[PDB]
């Protein structure tokens, strides 16, 4: 995570089995591939940090 596009805010969609799935285009900013890379998720705990995510 060495630039601001390595942390973007997404919208949850709850799915079965245990991987995070993301669209393919978003993959080049994160600089990820699917050979076992893991990515972290942070949930905002307030009504206002939510809007910080969705809007910035």
């Amino acid at each position: 995570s060495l630039h601001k596009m390595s942390m973007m805010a997404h919208r949850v969609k709850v799915i079965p089995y245990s991987t995070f799935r993301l669209n393919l285009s978003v993959t080049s900013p994160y600089n990820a591939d699917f050979d076992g890379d893991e990515m972290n998720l942070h949930v905002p705990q307030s009504e206002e940090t939510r809007a910080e995510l969705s809007q910035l």
Binding site: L24, T27, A32, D33, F34, D35
Partner: protein, 49 residues
């Protein structure tokens, strides 16, 4: 199967392809201290413990 994913075949998984066994082994041991306090292998109850 992009970016190094792959599609595997669900039927072949059902028939055994790449199944494996896993064996995790736990050790435990009871210690003596001064022949005064000495751990013990027993099944406890919520009444004495």
């Amino acid at each position: 199967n992009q970016e190094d994913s792959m599609i595997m075949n669900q039927s072949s998984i059902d028939r055994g392809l790449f199944r494996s066994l896993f064996f995790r082994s736990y050790m435990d041991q009871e210690k003596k201290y001064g022949m005064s306090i000495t751990e013990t292998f027993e099944k406890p109850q919520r009444t004495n413990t």
